[PDB]
Amino acid sequence: MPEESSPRRTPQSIPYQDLPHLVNADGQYLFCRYWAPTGTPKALIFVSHGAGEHSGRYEELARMLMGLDLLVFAHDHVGHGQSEGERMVVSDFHVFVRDVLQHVDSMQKDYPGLPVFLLGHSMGGAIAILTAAERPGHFAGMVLISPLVLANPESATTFKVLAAKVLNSVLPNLSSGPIDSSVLSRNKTEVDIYNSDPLICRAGLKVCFGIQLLNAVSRVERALPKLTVPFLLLQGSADRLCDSKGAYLLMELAKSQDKTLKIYEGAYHVLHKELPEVTNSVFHEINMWVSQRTA
Ligand SMILES: O=C1COc2ccc(C(=O)N3CCC(Cc4ccccc4)CC3)cc2N1
Numbered sequence: 001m002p003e004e005s006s007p008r009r010t011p012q013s014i015p016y017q018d019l020p021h022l023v024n025a026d027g028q029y030l031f032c033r034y035w036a037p038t039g040t041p042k043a044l045i046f047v048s049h050g051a052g053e054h055s056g057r058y059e060e061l062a063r064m065l066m067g068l069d070l071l072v073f074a075h076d077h078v079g080h081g082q083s084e085g086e087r088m089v090v091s092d093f094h095v096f097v098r099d100v101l102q103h104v105d106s107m108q109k110d111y112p113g114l115p116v117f118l119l120g121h122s123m124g125g126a127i128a129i130l131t132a133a134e135r136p137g138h139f140a141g142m143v144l145i146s147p148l149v150l151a152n153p154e155s156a157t158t159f160k161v162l163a164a165k166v167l168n169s170v171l172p173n174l175s176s177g178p179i180d181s182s183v184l185s186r187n188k189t190e191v192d193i194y195n196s197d198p199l200i201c202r203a204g205l206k207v208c209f210g211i212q213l214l215n216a217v218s219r220v221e222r223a224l225p226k227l228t229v230p231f232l233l234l235q236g237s238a239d240r241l242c243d244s245k246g247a248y249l250l251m252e253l254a255k256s257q258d259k260t261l262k263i264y265e266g267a268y269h270v271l272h273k274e275l276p277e278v279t280n281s282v283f284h285e286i287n288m289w290v291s292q293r294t295a
């Protein structure tokens with residue numbers, strides 16, 4: 001008699017049978033999160049995390065959104081957090097967009113006729129833009145927190161040289177240095193929390209993944225004149241990771257009839273985990289923006 005193989009486990013050795021999950025088109029398990037209100041939801045909202053991090057970092061934002069009677073859902077992107085895949089590796093950047101679309105499609109089957117929003121930070125913002133651009137008119141709105149539109153110029157110039165060298169030869173281990181965690185937020189407690197989280201990949205950026213982030217930037221640029229989805233864009237003026245010039249480019253080139261930019265003067269990258277004055281404003285602005293578009 002044949003036997004069923006050992007249960008599939010997360011990279012942290014937890015069986016997927018014990019966790020909310022989804023199997024993607026490549027047969028990879030993605031770890032899922034849900035925050036549903038007690039009553040009938042007004043809308044659905046997918047939360048799209050950034051490079052190296054995971055969906056668990058959106059607990060507070062998701063509970064605020066759930067408090068607005070929205071059903072919030074997320075997953076860890078392939079190669080991240082509790083999902084399968086070699087850490088910080090992706091065959092093509094579109095895998096992330098395809099998987100967001102599978103999860104949105106699955107949720108819309110369980111909750112038909114509901115409007116669907118996207119919330120994305122940084123790489124997760126680039127994924128949200130490409131997701132909305134793939135399906136014009138399907139999403140009700142997008143909330144972008146320091147989305148990856150234009151990388152820091154000095155950082156991108158150094159990386160593009162490193163990328164062309166990997167593209168010309170066989171160097172599977174080549175990586176750039178790790179992200180300077182101090183540039184993430186002026187809130188030192190949040191920098192320390194980021195450095196303490198075992199689900200975060202704090203290793204150097206592998207050149208192959210960096211090339212996919214370069215592809216994301218190129219694709220976002222091409223997608224902008226196709227964008228018609230309503231959006232709220234939040235950007236720090238002192239962001240060393242996603243250049244503020246990218247947020248002005250998105251406001252200028254998107255075709256969306258409903259677009260709003262809020263600049264946080266002197267703020268760093270992770271606006272939803274910045275100094276309390278910034279973070280409280282970020283939560284309040286998202287709250288007002290989504291409440292106005294779900295009323
Ligand atoms: O809360 C956190 C935790 O720490 C992070 C770390 C990374 C990012 C991120 O997604 N990118 C996009 C990619 C950026 C570099 C890049 C490389 C190559 C091309 C374009 C940009 C860096 C910033 C986001 C956060 N946010």
Ligand code: NA
Nearest residue numbers: 106107109110
């Ligand atoms: Na379903």
